[PDB]
Symmetry: D2
């Protein structure tokens, strides 16, 4: 299945935060309605935050996360979870090699804000 | 039910990160095997990161998140999600008032690291 | 927090299924837009299905699960999870006593159907 | 990533339940520690329960779900969620064709029982 694609409510503020756990330099691309609106590039093996931004989901509400290392796409896994019928998490893990820890770039999307 | 309590595998490195979305100053306490090992304090209405740390789950693996605002315990909601049978998220929302957005402090715990 | 309350898309078919794991007879009430539309009653300590139905979420999309044993309300825990940005689960556990297994009645709501 | 594979605690009773939502007849295979221990078969476009069983996770705790339609493997999506640090759901969706609803067979694994 396609992974890393989420339908948010339209015209809604959301946060996106990426963590790195890999020897490879992670490039996280955030697309809103098929346009790149944020890019984080960084490296850590200690869960360092490579970026965090507030964005708007726009008319279509489509948010897509892509992760690559040195131009090669990582394999993605994702899910959305809702707590208290209001607090939303859209979660992405990614794997750049063969150890299958899926933590090489970890991306958390959260809404609502404020 | 009790919320914000998670059993991690023993002696395992994990990340903990907190975001704020409230007029109130949030105080997030992280306990590992019933000892306070991190405290994050801050205020934001725009998803600022008020803290992020790497910790070890120790012999018992017990991790508890507490959130308080101006001396009062916030109401917590929580769940753990596992992707690809390997990548773990322990998620906490909290509510300091009556609007029930449960985003006033948002806490994400993730493992494995590295 | 309030638990067992979910907002579904309006006017949408969904399934609801209840399992029992308790010495006590479980009463599961399913409310759609604040009206009880199904009641499942049964007893099992081995995960028997005490009820399953297909229902419609109506204009407001509000679905609420209540669980009681001999007229006394059980304590609830709940979350919603979405896979492949399409497949939805709304999950409820409940506790009728003090062992905190939260499996005494387990309720799974799923959509879309068809 | 591999999907539909879950590590349960060893030697633990669990429930597995499957629903169908497709014109195609679903065959759900349940493997425990790499041995087939249950097969559920049926055809419904209205969320019929095509099987429910109680099984034991054995020494290794490995549970795998496979889904096929007339001999052809469906594409799987999956995740595990834990509520109240105790109640576990292992969730599978599957897609037999081109609409990407991922509901064609839906499988819910739950533990603990009793
Ligand atoms: C410079 C690059 C190294 C790799 S890799 O294939 O070795 N993958 C990085 C691995 O780093 C380990 C320390 C560990 O975190 C493992 O999970 C990770 O996949 C590149 C692709 S680029
Ligand atoms: C200085 C403090 C104000 C409050 S409060 O009860 O008003 N709660 C804060 C509320 O802030 C809003 C901007 C919004 O984020 C809302 O969700 C939040 O509960 C204190 C408790 S302390
Ligand atoms: C006949 C009744 C017994 C109880 S109870 O309070 O003892 N709770 C039932 C308990 O049953 C156990 C077998 C186990 O499943 C436990 O988790 C459950 O809470 C009534 C309330 S009525
Ligand atoms: C090319 C293929 C067609 C089928 S099918 O005819 O069995 N249809 C499967 C579809 O049934 C619909 C009613 C709907 O539930 C849809 O989601 C489902 O995939 C194949 C098995 S392969
Ligand atoms: Ca890796
Ligand atoms: Ca890694
Ligand atoms: Ca609030
Ligand atoms: Ca708030
Ligand atoms: Ca109980
Ligand atoms: Ca029980
Ligand atoms: Ca389909
Ligand atoms: Ca279908």
């Amino acid at each position: 299945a396609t992974q890393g694609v989420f339908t948010l409510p339209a015209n809604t503020q959301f946060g996106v935060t990426a963590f790195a756990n890999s020897a490879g330099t992670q490039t996280v691309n955030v697309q809103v309605n098929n346009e790149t609106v944020a890019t984080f590039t960084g490296q850590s093996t200690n869960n360092a935050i490579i970026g965090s931004k507030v964005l708007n989901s726009g008319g279509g509400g489509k948010v897509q996360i892509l992760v690559s290392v040195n131009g090669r796409s990582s394999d993605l896994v994702s899910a959305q979870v809702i707590l208290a019928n209001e607090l939303n998490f859209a979660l992405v893990g990614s794997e750049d090699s063969t150890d299958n820890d899926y933590n090489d770039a970890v991306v958390v999307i959260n809404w609502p804000l404020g």
